[PDB]
Amino acid sequence: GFIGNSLPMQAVYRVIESAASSKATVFITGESGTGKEVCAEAIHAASPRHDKPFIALNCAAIPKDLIESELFGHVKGAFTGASTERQGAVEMAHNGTLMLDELCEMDLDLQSKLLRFIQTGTYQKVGSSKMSSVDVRFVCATNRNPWEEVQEGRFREDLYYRLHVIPISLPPLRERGGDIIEIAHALLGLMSLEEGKSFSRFSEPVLRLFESYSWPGNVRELQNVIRNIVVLNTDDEVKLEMVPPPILEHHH
């Protein structure tokens, strides 16, 4: 779902294609705002299991005490809030690909249960001792340095080495050559549809700025900038005075 054919992305695409035909676990890293879920979905789409579900569990978007419920499910009444019985992400992903995003947010207890599941395919819903099993291909991602999480004792060493089979390090936006403006154009069209506008081009100073700024927030930051411009202005062309702070100030 990536856009562009910059040199560093070509290397990513080659690994995606080769990894897609394997069940080996992929472990994605990259700076804040790089496309970890885009990469995970692209692996699924290129894989023989592309017609089965792709499911992404963002471990940070969930209270830490509820990751286990979201991952493995829960029976009714398993904990005070368990209003009904819930199907886990592992069941939704059976025969497909499960992305464990922001994996280092799991507590050490859940990491132990996860490692068991990865080894065997067997799990239990929260609140039950009954075993079930599924078949998932795992893709993991983190914005931490996973080796550092291990050295600091926040992430299990056995789990790290079980999962870290096919690492993919995503190129930061600033290193992606022509991809920056290709992505920016796609976002310009999409945000224009969202907002009822009709932006179609960037002026040459805007092109130069977007192609020189360091984009510390990567593609998320570019999405914010394009959304800002389309929400706050009405024109066919993005002009330099429309670019929000502190892009220009920081750039200098």
Residue numbers in the entry: 141 to 392
Paper text:
LuxO belongs to the subfamily of AAA+ ATPases known as bacterial enhancer-binding proteins (bEBPs).
To characterize the mechanism of AzaU inhibition of LuxO, we crystallized V. angustum LuxO-C in the absence of ligands (apo), in the presence of ATP, and in the presence of AzaU. We also observed the same helical arrays of LuxO monomers in crystal structures of the V. angustum C domain alone (LuxO-C), either as the apo-protein, with ATP bound, or with the inhibitor AzaU bound (discussed below).
